């Protein structure tokens, strides 16, 4: 807002708004993701180490 | 990846708002910077959004697409000078950008093909809405119909694959393998036209010659690469059938390579030289790819990326002459070392990269591809030698005759080099030197 | 199982990582032989064969397991190749003899 | 000397020398500074013929023999040689004649 | 190459485009006669 | 124009940087903004971020084991590079009748 | 299981969690269409796209309803399709005997040597 | 509803007549409905204001009347020698019934009347013949089940349907040839299945409906008129003309959605060869559509001088370019359509 960024970053916010909306949506994808969350066959902790540690 | 997608959609409005050519430009570079930051992938599909993923193979291709798509706006400013519907230009570019991202991230074959062939339109706008030569009409006919005449038929192969497979995610096809001898040609040849192949090179010189700086940069910078990216994903299950019938394709590519290089020597148009040159390099890429060996494939990925970059920069050079001396001919353009000596530096460098002079991600390619082909068949060496030899040969001629001889008598006063073009040339080349430090991301994807 | 896509995907990733290591063990043995040949100007035959041959065996073993598959190669094609080789060894004898 | 063939060319052909000078020295279109070049028919002729000569191409014996021996026989012969050699080499390979010791390019 | 495809195709298409116009530049009697013939052929083949 | 005009040119004219040929400040702010976004933002910070990127492809980790695995097999006395995907005993070859000349491959 | 059971493979055992986007997508597609159409209307008529927002609100309202109305029809439609297919499997178990899952260790495929 | 009030009446009677056919239980009832269609449509087609309308009327009547004559006749034979409407099998009794229906709807070998028609017809009259006068004969073709005749029709339904379109300069004849090609797709689609055929016709109806409905609006009757038609910006000249590419159904134009549906189900039937041929010709269809779109893709052409302003109806224009906007962004409604499963 130094008159060298007048109306330019202001409109430029909306692309940044896109990133915020894009981020939140994909984070929710990480929600539908959860079927093997710690229940894999390679990283899968058998039982214990939970301790409020939802690895990813 | 939806982060990128939503960013581009929220950039679309700027096309309507007046005087946003430069604001759009900075944003496209800025998001490219953001997409740079997002990098942790392995061979497995990653960043699995609703239907969008990303991978070694797709990650670099997307970065180049975002990279080149931002560099358009640096390249083309005569649109602003003329006020030639800058709004439609900016909208066309962004639409193209979104399609490329969705093409390269479509984890389904059908989604991939859908965006792949959806890109037929916005490119056609870019040539036709801002072309110069009257040939622009027939050129658009060549481009569109060479593509659709084979790009449509793979639609059957895709659905046939569905019926026999049950889906079209890439990992799922890899589990199976098909040998019905038409599936192979229908998919292969359909990609080969856009590759393109020497026997179907025909359209490509025309499309480049009568297209603006922007369209030509797009055409040689992605479209050819996009065809190749599909190949890398699809040949996973075409192996047996490919092995039976592969000598034909490698032969015509290698044979066509020396020929098209000799066409370059005899050619007399800056865009024609580069256009034929780009076909030559994509000939070798098609060869190493169809070798299917590890060395071939991992090198093909690299050479596509490097070739796209060098081809773009050379097109900016061709634009520079076309925008000063107003004529594409070799004859008119000459002795520019006397008029833009600091520019002729960049002429040399971009030429250097195209003849595989290090440190150059292009060069890194040919080591990989040439190793693959030589292993595949010792007979190749007798033509590989000449192919590279004439590759460098015409590039030498292009650099020298354009920049060296005594000036042309009839030449009307034209402005000198300028920051936009200077920065444009650095931006295409300097990353082409950067990447060698960390080729592993651009070198390993299998 | 025949169609256990998640399991097959898990197997391939194990195969890839194992490939990357065994891929490597060839390199390290090469680097090891490299040092010896640099050891002393007269000292080449002093320990070339005693040290190189480890690298020689490593290459051939590495080829047999992973070699000849090309890119895209997953656990399935590698695993069944071993099956094919076992069948060949049992039927036609040592590879490197033609057939009977 | 043909009786003035050189002369007959001389008269007209020396006129446009001056017009070239007038064009080149033209202070006005050089002042416009838009770039560009004095028009030159030979250049314009040359570009047009260079881009278009198919409408002249008659598919006769000459062109056919020319093209046939230009790429076709090259393409066919080279491809046939490649396939033939590979067929032999692969035949040895699938026969198992050469074990996992002698063979080359173990690493592609 | 382009003669084998390219412009030559558009040349042959124009030839055939002209032809179809000559078909369609006629009197309606001719076309109905076609249809009558098609009927007549099917009718006798029912008998045969 | 005359001697002093050339000698000390006025601050009216302005040499376009190739981006905007209408306003001085619009051209200069465009070039200023364009240069920053392109060079520093990507070709310094981004290069820095890659150069210090963590193990993504697990190459370094692969050559973690490379030292260990080799060392593990060398005191273990088992083959350093085992040529079998799994144990040749674990595999169960089917009988020759099942083979029935199914084009066995070397 | 190790048993390729057609019915149980088809049965709605669940494990289908809708996204925050899964139901909302149609409403914010039809309404977005109708809003864009009104902008399209004014754009061709040489009228301000902003102007006459009553057209835009109405277009949004109708579209939103249709998407919700048609989302409903689909979900019924899909439910019925599953019902028939499960019915036909139960009708003709003889035609679709349950098949057994095997493992690659029990099969011999043919590979492709690049060599 | 073009000029008079009687337009509403004859349209209504036409609808009832054709609706009888599609709901007809026996061949005779279907024939009855068809003739009622023949009545109701002739007056609309035969405007008394001009000449060309009247000549189209004799040709339409003189053709359809024979079609109905043969249709009923062949019905009696089939429903004699089989003594039942649903014959056990398709024999020579039945091919004649298709040949009747194919002529009535203007299919491949029986089409010549159909281009000559277009000269006479005005736009919406043409439109109405394009869309609605092809439902009943096609829905009957559904009941008839002779593979090979439909196949020869489909083979020839694009060859002429595109080669002629290359040649025509009168928009009236181009629409004829454009539809004959599209009619090729319906016929194949109906040989495969009916639900997909229903969908494809509807999208064709929609698309042809919007297309000719603007040509009516601006009264553009010749390629020259298209190049000459004034638009203030020569940008909506281009935005509106995307639909000419929606004709070819290239993905981002919503014409792809039906063509994709037909292709998917057709190849599921495994008639791959047939797809190749129709789809080869599709390019020729799209070819002359680009030949049309030279008017708008590039901008700022050479124009006539006298025109200063361009005007059109509120109602027609307001309806028209809503349909266009859908032709632009139609695909993302992928979810909204649930009739494909
Ligand atoms: C990078 C970069 O451009 O930075 C600016 C600058 C290049 O511009 P410059 O040094 O001012 O050129 C001299 C004058 O500007 C005056 O330059 P000039 O207008 O007289 O033109 C001289 C030359 C400009 O280039 C040079 O004079 C050679 C300097 C390397 C380029 O360009 C030409 O016109 C000759 C044609 C180019 C031939 C290709 C020469 C580079 C070969 C690369 C081999 C590796 O590069 C450097 O900062 C250091 C260059 C020293 C070499 C280190 C390698 C880099």
Automatic annotation (TrEMBL), chain A:
It comes from the Eukaryota. Keywords: Electron transport, Membrane, Mitochondrion, Mitochondrion inner membrane, Respiratory chain, Transmembrane, Transmembrane helix, Transport. One of its GO terms (cellular component) is mitochondrial inner membrane. One of its GO terms (biological process) is mitochondrial electron transport, NADH to ubiquinone. InterPro entries: NDUB1. Pfam families: NADH_oxidored (PF08040). It is a single-pass membrane protein. Signal peptide: none annotated. It is found in: Mitochondrion inner membrane; Mitochondrion membrane. Accessory subunit of the mitochondrial membrane respiratory chain NADH dehydrogenase (Complex I) that is believed not to be involved in catalysis. Complex I functions in the transfer of electrons from NADH to the respiratory chain. The immediate electron acceptor for the enzyme is believed to be ubiquinone. PANTHER family: NADH DEHYDROGENASE [UBIQUINONE] 1 BETA SUBCOMPLEX SUBUNIT 1 (PTHR15222). Belongs to the complex I NDUFB1 subunit family. Complex I is composed of 45 different subunits. This is NADH dehydrogenase [ubiquinone] 1 beta subcomplex subunit 1. It comes from Drosophila melanogaster (Fruit fly). The gene is ND-MNLL.
UniProtKB/TrEMBL annotation, chain C:
Keywords: Electron transport, Membrane, Mitochondrion, Mitochondrion inner membrane, Respiratory chain, Transport. It is a peripheral membrane protein. GO terms for biological process: mitochondrial electron transport, NADH to ubiquinone. GO terms for cellular component: mitochondrial inner membrane; mitochondrion; respiratory chain complex I. The gene is ND-PDSW. Its main location: mitochondrion. Disulfide bonds join 36-48. This is NADH dehydrogenase [ubiquinone] 1 beta subcomplex subunit 10. Coiled coil: none annotated. It is found in: Mitochondrion inner membrane. Belongs to the complex I NDUFB10 subunit family. The keyword Membrane applies.
UniProtKB/TrEMBL annotation, chain D:
InterPro entries: NADH_UbQ_OxRdtase_NDUFB4_su. It holds the Pfam family NDUF_B4. The keyword Oxidoreductase applies. Keywords: Electron transport, Membrane, Mitochondrion, Mitochondrion inner membrane, Oxidoreductase, Respiratory chain, Transmembrane, Transmembrane helix, Transport. It is a single-pass membrane protein. It comes from the Eukaryota. One of its GO terms (molecular function) is oxidoreductase activity. Its main location: mitochondrion. Signal peptide: none annotated. GO terms for cellular component: mitochondrial inner membrane; mitochondrion; respiratory chain complex I. It is found in: Mitochondrion inner membrane. The keyword Transcription regulation does not apply. The chain crosses the membrane at residues 64-82. GO terms for biological process: mitochondrial electron transport, NADH to ubiquinone. Belongs to the complex I NDUFB4 subunit family. PANTHER family: NADH DEHYDROGENASE [UBIQUINONE] 1 BETA SUBCOMPLEX SUBUNIT 4 (PTHR15469:SF0), NADH-UBIQUINONE OXIDOREDUCTASE B15 SUBUNIT (PTHR15469). This is NADH dehydrogenase [ubiquinone] 1 beta subcomplex subunit 4. It comes from Drosophila melanogaster (Fruit fly). The lineage of its organism: Eukaryota, Metazoa, Ecdysozoa, Arthropoda, Hexapoda. The gene is ND-B15.
TrEMBL record, chain F:
It is a single-pass membrane protein. It comes from the Eukaryota. Coiled coil: none annotated. Keywords: Electron transport, Membrane, Mitochondrion, Mitochondrion inner membrane, Respiratory chain, Transit peptide, Transmembrane, Transmembrane helix, Transport. The chain crosses the membrane at residues 34-52. It is found in: Mitochondrion inner membrane. One of its GO terms (biological process) is respiratory electron transport chain. One of its GO terms (cellular component) is mitochondrial inner membrane. The keyword Transport applies. Belongs to the complex I NDUFB11 subunit family. Complex I is composed of 45 different subunits. Interacts with BCAP31. Accessory subunit of the mitochondrial membrane respiratory chain NADH dehydrogenase (Complex I), that is believed not to be involved in catalysis. Complex I functions in the transfer of electrons from NADH to the respiratory chain. The immediate electron acceptor for the enzyme is believed to be ubiquinone. This is NADH dehydrogenase [ubiquinone] 1 beta subcomplex subunit 11, mitochondrial. The chain holds residues 45 to 150 of 150 of the full protein.
């Amino acid at each position: 807002m130094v008159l060298g960024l007048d109306k330019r970053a202001l409109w430029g916010a909306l692309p940044l708004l896109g990133f915020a909306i894009g981020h939140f949506l994909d984070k929710k994808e990480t929600e539908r993701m959860t079927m093997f969350r710690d229940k894999s066959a390679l990283y899968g902790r058998p039982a214990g180490s939970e301790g409020k540690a939802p690895s990813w | 990846m939806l982060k990128i997608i939503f960013f581009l959609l929220f950039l679309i409005p700027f096309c309507f708002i007046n005087n946003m050519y430069w604001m759009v430009q900075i944003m496209m570079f800025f998001i490219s910077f953001i997409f740079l930051l997002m990098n942790n992938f392995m061979n497995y599909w990653s960043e699995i959004s609703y239907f969008l993923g990303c991978d070694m193979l797709s990650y670099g291709l997307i970065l180049l697409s975002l990279w080149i798509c931002s560099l358009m706006l640096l390249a083309s400013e005569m649109i602003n000078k003329h006020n030639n519907y800058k709004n439609l230009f900016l909208l066309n570019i962004i639409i193209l950008l979104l399609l490329l991202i969705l093409t390269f991230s479509s984890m389904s074959l059908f989604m991939f093909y859908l965006f792949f062939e959806s890109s037929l339109i916005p490119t056609l706008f870019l040539i036709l809405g801002w072309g110069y030569q009257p040939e622009r009409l027939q050129a658009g006919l060549y481009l569109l119909f060479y593509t659709l005449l084979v790009s449509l038929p793979m639609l059957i192969g895709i659905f046939y694959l569905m019926n026999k497979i049950g889906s079209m995610n890439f990992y799922l096809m890899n589990n199976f393998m098909f040998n019905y001898d038409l599936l192979y040609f229908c998919l292969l040849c359909a990609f080969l036209v856009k590759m393109p192949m020497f026997l179907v090179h025909l359209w490509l010189p025309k499309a480049h010659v009568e297209a603006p700086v922007s369209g030509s940069m797009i055409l040689a910078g992605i479209m050819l690469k996009l065809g190749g990216y599909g190949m890398l994903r699809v040949i996973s299950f075409l192996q047996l059938m490919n092995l039976k019938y592969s000598f034909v394709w490698i032969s015509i590519s290698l044979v066509g390579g020396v020929l098209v290089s000799l066409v370059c020597l005899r050619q007399t148009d800056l865009k024609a030289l580069i256009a034929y040159s780009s076909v030559a390099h994509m000939g070798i890429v098609l060869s190493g790819l169809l070798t299917m060996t590890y060395w071939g494939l991992c090198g093909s990925y690299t050479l596509m990326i490097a070739h796209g970059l060098c081809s773009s920069g050379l097109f900016c050079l061709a634009n520079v002459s076309y925008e000063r001396l107003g004529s594409r001919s070799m004859l008119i353009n000459k002795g520019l070392l006397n008029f833009m000596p600091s520019m002729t530096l960049w002429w040399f460098l971009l030429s250097s990269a195209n003849m595989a002079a290090p440190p150059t991600l292009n060069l890194l390619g040919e080591i990989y591809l040439l190793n693959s082909i030589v292993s595949w068949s010792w007979i190749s060496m007798i033509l590989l030698s000449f192919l590279s030899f004439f590759s460098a040969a015409y590039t030498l001629y292009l650099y020298s005759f354009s920049q060296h001889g005594k000036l042309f008598s009839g030449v009307y006063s034209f402005s000198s080099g300028k920051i936009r073009e200077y920065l444009l040339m650095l931006l295409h080349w300097l990353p082409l030197n950067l990447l060698i430090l960390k080729s592993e991301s651009f070198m390993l994807w299998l | 199982y025949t169609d256990d896509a998640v399991c097959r995907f898990e197997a391939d990733q194990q195969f890839r990582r194992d490939r990357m290591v065994d891929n490597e063990i060839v390199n390290i043995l090469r680097q090891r032989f490299e040092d010896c040949t640099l050891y002393e100007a007269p000292d080449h035959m002093v320990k070339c064969r005693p040290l190189m041959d480890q690298y020689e065996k490593a290459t051939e073993n590495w080829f047999i397991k992973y070699g000849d598959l090309g890119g895209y190669a997953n656990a399935k094609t590698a695993y069944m190749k071993q099956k094919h080789r076992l069948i060949w060894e049992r039927r036609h004898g040592p590879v490197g003899s033609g057939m009977k | 000397e043909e009786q003035e063939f050189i002369k007959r060319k001389h008269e007209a052909t020396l006129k446009l020398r001056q017009e070239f000078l007038k064009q080149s020295s033209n202070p006005y279109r050089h002042a416009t500074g838009e770039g560009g070049t004095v028009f030159d028919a030979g250049l314009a002729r040359f570009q047009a013929m260079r881009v278009s000569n198919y409408e002249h191409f008659k598919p006769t014996g000459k062109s056919f023999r020319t093209g046939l021996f230009a790429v076709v026989l090259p393409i066919a012969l080279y491809a046939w040689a490649l396939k033939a050699e590979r067929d032999g080499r692969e035949e040895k390979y699938r026969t198992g004649q050469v074990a996992y010791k002698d063979r080359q390019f173990k690493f592609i | 190459s382009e003669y084998f495809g390219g412009q030559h195709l558009y040349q042959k298409l124009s030839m055939y485009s002209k032809t179809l116009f000559l078909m369609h530049n006629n009197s309606l009697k001719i076309y109905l006669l076609l249809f009558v013939f098609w009927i007549l052929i099917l009718l006798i083949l029912l008998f045969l | 124009l005359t001697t002093e005009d050339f000698a000390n040119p006025s601050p009216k004219n302005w040499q376009s940087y190739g981006f905007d040929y209408k306003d001085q400040v619009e051209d200069r702010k465009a070039t200023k903004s364009t240069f920053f976004v392109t060079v520093t933002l990507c070709l310094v910070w981004g290069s820095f971020y890659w150069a210090y990127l963590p193990d993504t492809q697990f190459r370094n980790w692969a050559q973690r084991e490379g030292f260990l695995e080799l060392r593990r097999r060398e005191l273990a006395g088992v083959d350093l590079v085992s040529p079998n995907y799994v144990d040749p005993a674990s595999i169960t070859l089917p009988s020759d009748e099942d083979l029935g000349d199914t084009e066995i491959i070397i | 299981s190790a048993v390729n059971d057609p019915l149980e493979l088809l049965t709605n055992k669940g494990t289908h969690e809708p996204s925050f986007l899964s139901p909302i997508w149609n409403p914010i597609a039809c309404g977005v269409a109708g809003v864009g159409a009104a902008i399209f209307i004014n754009w061709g008529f040489r009228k301000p796209v902003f102007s006459g927002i009553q057209k835009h609100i109405a277009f949004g309202a109708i579209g939103v309803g249709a998407g919700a109305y048609f989302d409903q029809k689909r979900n019924e439609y899909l439910a019925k399709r599953d019902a028939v297919l499960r019915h036909y499997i139960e009708l003709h178990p003889d035609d679709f005997p349950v098949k057994e899952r095997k493992t690659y260790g029990q099969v011999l495929e043919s590979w492709v040597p690049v060599r | 509803m073009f000029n008079n009030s009687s337009k509403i009446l004859f349209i209504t009677i036409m609808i009832i007549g054709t609706l009888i056919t599609v709901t007809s239980n026996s061949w005779l009832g279907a024939w009855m409905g068809l003739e009622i269609n023949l009545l109701s449509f002739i007056p609309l087609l035969s405007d008394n204001n001009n000449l060309m309308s009247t000549e189209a009327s004799l040709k339409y009547f003189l053709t359809q009347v024979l079609a109905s004559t043969v249709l009923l006749f062949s019905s009696i034979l089939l429903m004699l020698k089989n003594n039942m409407n649903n014959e056990i099998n398709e024999s020579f009794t039945s091919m004649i019934i298709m040949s009747a229906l194919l002529l009535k709807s203007g299919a491949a070998p029986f089409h010549f009347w159909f281009p000559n028609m277009m000269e006479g017809l005005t736009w919406m009259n043409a439109l109405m013949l394009m869309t609605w006068q092809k439902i009943a004969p096609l829905m009957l073709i559904s009941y008839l089940n002779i593979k090979y005749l439909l196949l020869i029709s489909v083979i020839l339904s694009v060859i002429i349907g595109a080669i002629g379109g290359l040649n025509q300069t009168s928009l009236r004849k181009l629409m004829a040839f454009s539809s004959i090609n599209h009619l090729g797709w319906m016929l194949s689609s109906l040989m495969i299945s009916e639900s997909i055929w229903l969908i494809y016709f509807f999208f064709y109806s929609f698309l042809s409906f919007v297309l000719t409905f603007m040509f009516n609006i601006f009264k553009l009757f010749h390629l020259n008129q298209l190049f000459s038609w004034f638009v203030n910006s020569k940008i909506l000249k281009f935005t509106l003309f995307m639909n000419f590419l929606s004709l070819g159904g290239l993905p981002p134009f919503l014409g792809f959605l039906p063509k994709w549906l037909v292709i998917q189900q057709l190849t599921l039937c495994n008639q791959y060869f047939m797809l190749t041929l129709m789809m080869m010709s599709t390019l020729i269809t799209l070819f002359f559509y680009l030949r049309i779109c030279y008017s708008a893709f590039m901008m700022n052409y050479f124009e006539n001088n006298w025109i200063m302003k361009m005007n059109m109806n509120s109602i027609n224009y307001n309806m028209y370019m809503i349909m266009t906007f859908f032709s632009i962004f139609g695909l993302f409604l992928i979810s909204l359509f649930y009739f494909m499963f």
